[PDB]
Amino acid sequence: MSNIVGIEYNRVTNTTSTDFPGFSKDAENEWNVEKFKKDFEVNISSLDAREANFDLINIDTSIANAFRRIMISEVPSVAAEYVYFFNNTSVIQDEVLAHRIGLVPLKVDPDMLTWVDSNLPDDEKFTDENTIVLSLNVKCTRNPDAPKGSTDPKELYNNAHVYARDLKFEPQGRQSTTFADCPVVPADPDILLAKLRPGQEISLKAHCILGIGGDHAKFSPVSTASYRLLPQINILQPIKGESARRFQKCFPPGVIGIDEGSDEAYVKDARKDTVSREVLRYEEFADKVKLGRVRNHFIFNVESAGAMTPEEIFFKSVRILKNKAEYLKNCPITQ
Amino acid sequence: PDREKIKLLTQATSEDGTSASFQIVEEDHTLGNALRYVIMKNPDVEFCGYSIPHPSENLLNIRIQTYGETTAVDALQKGLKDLMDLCDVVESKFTEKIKSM
C-alpha cells in the first residue's frame, strides 16, 4: 500500500487517494501550495511534432484525469462542419463524403479563428474570423496512354483517387493576409477521401469552424491523449539460475535484466513494463515478486491529430481547467 | 455577471451554512472530481461529493458539509481558488520543463 496500487492475480487494490485530512487522526495532507509546488515534478521523456511523452509526478488522479478529459473533449480544434456539394457523381453518397471531410484533420492553428455565434442568420453567421473555406474540384478521365490491359487504376484513369490534399484553401477577406504565411492544409494529405471512375466528378466546398471534441469527435485534437501509472516491480527475494530466465520471460523483453556474476535477476526498466501480471500465474514467484503501480506517477502520452503541438494541447488543457475554476469562482451564487 | 452558472439549492441547504448543494451547469466529472478532491483537502470540510443527476442534462450538483468553522460557500470558494493555484503550479512546471528540455 502507501501510494502503491496493488496488482494481484485476481484484483487491483489501494486504488484511491487517501491523502486528505480526515483519513486518519494525523490530519495531515491538508491543501497548501509550496508543498504541492516542491513535490510536483514534470519529466518530459520525449517531444515530437505530434507525440509528447511526459511524466506528471506527485499529482492526484483526479487532476491528471481532468487534464486527460479536457485534452480529449474540451480543447477546441478546427474541422469542416458544413459541406456544400455543387456536384458529386461518385459512388460515395454526399452525407458519407461530408462525414469523411469532417473527419479530415486540418493543419490550421486554433486561436487564429473565432467561435461561430449560433444566434446569427446563416447569411451573416460565417465571417472571415469564424470560418475556413476549403474547395474540392476533382474530375476523372481516361488516361491517354497505352499501358498493359486492366492495370491498377493509377495510370489507367486520371484523378481516380481523391485525397485530402485535393482540399484547396480558399482565403476569404482578410484571410488572404493573416493566413499568407501559413496556408491551411490537411494534417494528413494522403487520406483517401474518395475513389471514382471516368465520368464521375466531385465539386464541393467545406466551411471549417472551431469546435469541441465533446460536441463531435472530428473536433478532438488528439488521436489519443492518455496516461498510465508508472509500473513498480519489487523482487522480494533473489531469483537466480534458470528460474531467473523464466522470471525474465514473463515481462516485456527489456523490463528486468539478469546480473552478470551475482546472477540474480533485477528490475532493469519498469517503465517498459505492460502490466500483464504474467508472473502472478506461476506459483514459483508467488512469494518472490510484488507487482504494483505508483498511484501519483502519471506517464502521459499525448499524440496530436496534427493541428497543434502536443505540448500546446496539454498546456491548453491545464489552462482550461484553471479558467473554468476561475470563472466559477467569479460567478455569483444564485439562490 | 453570470447568474445561471452556479446556483445554491435552497432545499438542500442547512441553517447558518455549513451544508449546501450547489447546482453548476455545463460542467461534468472533469471539474466535479478535481473540485471534490481539492475541497476534501480542506480540514473544515467533512463531506464533499458531486453527482451528475442525469446524463441528458449538462448539470452537476456538488455537496459540501463542513463543521462549524466555515460555511459550505466559503469551502467551495477556497476549493476553487486552490484548484487555480494547483493549475498554476502545473503550468509553471510544464513551461519550465518545455523551455529547458
Binding site: 486561436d111 487564429m112 467561435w115 455565434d117 500546446e312 | 528540455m101
Partner: peptide
Amino acid sequence: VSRDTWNTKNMRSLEPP
C-alpha cells in the same frame, strides 16, 4: 520542439462561445 507557443500566441479559441 521545446519552444513555447502558449506564451507567444494569444489563445482566442479558449474563450467561451
